[PDB]
Ligand SMILES: Cc1cc2nc3c(=O)[nH]c(=O)nc-3n(C[C@H](O)[C@H](O)[C@H](O)COP(=O)(O)O)c2cc1C
């Protein structure tokens with residue numbers, strides 16, 4: 399019981415506005431773990447590593463998830479803050495990608511040894527369904543206190 | 553109400569572990585297909601750019617065997633360029649629907665045109681199996697995690713904390 403069509407003219411000014419529209423629909427629809435996102439990290443050799451974590455909060459400063467601060471991710475993040483997030487909503491032909499730096503949350507907002515990270519929003523991509531296979535893709539690049547928007551290839 | 557019905561499981565013990573991690577992987581994939589999950593072969597591939605920034609995108613698994621996992625891409629797409637500059641990659645099958653995840657770590661090598669033949673310039677890469685991790689759903693949030701590390705033509709196996 400479907401969805402098809404993502405053209406430049408449905409694009410909101412704040413990407414978080416399109417994100418929320420997609421996250422509700424995911425929860426509206428069946429989709430198990432609407433908030434599950436795959437976070438990628440890179441260790442000191444250049445190797446990426448992946449694992450799912452749940453999105454707990456989000457606003458313009460970034461996306462937040464919690465984790466044990468002594469696990470492979472926390473350790474990798476501390477040597478490399480560059481991470482990537484991907485909401486795998488392929489049940490609805492969708493995908494949301496977020497590139498950004500993982501700053502360690504304060505010991506304040508977490509209210510031991512168990513904290514969380516906030517991933518800033520430097521880029522956010524939206525990939526959408528495709529009857530035929532004309533994948534709609536739109537990238538939001540954070541530029542100069544503004545969002546530079548672009549259409550990409552399928 | 554269900555003609556094809558449904559079902560789920562629990563308990564990933566060290567005893568039931570096969571000698572070859574691809575036997576367990578084959579079991580979870582059959583089990584993903586049986587429970588009519590969406591795109592059971594969908595996996596998230598993660599590459600890294602020259603600056604050390606990771607990128608991620610869903611790709612579909614087209615074949616696997618002891619040499620590695622295969623997927624197809626266009627040869628002039630961002631992930632293709634990132635691999636040519638850095639073959640290190642991660643694959644993660646997002647089977648949360650079933651409380652599972654599988655992570656594969658290895659190097660992605662371009663397949664010979666002969667390989668691409670099995671099933672613009674659409675090509676294929678094969679990720680080797682240097683590590684494969686398994687994550688299952690144990691009761692009280694107390695999860696089961698196993699890592700298969702490839703070492704000297706064999707597999708070192710170790711449980712991990714949740
Ligand atoms: C649906 C689902 C939700 C999960 N949520 C979290 C979470 O919010 N934080 C976390 O650290 N791990 C979470 N995990 C476990 C991770 O996948 C991972 O095993 C763990 O964080 C340690 O990984 P690392 O050793 O790569 O650091 C979740 C797993 C699944 C399948």
Ligand SMILES: Cc1cc2nc3c(=O)[nH]c(=O)nc-3n(C[C@H](O)[C@H](O)[C@H](O)COP(=O)(O)O)c2cc1C
Pocket residue numbers: 487488491492493525533552591594607608609610611612613623624625626629630631632
């Ligand atoms: C269920 C599903 C399956 C997909 N399968 C493939 C695939 O097998 N190969 C591929 O190159 N892109 C596939 N895509 C699209 C990619 O995720 C992505 O848009 C594209 O290849 C991005 O490549 P780039 O990061 O190399 O620019 C799929 C998306 C979904 C939701």
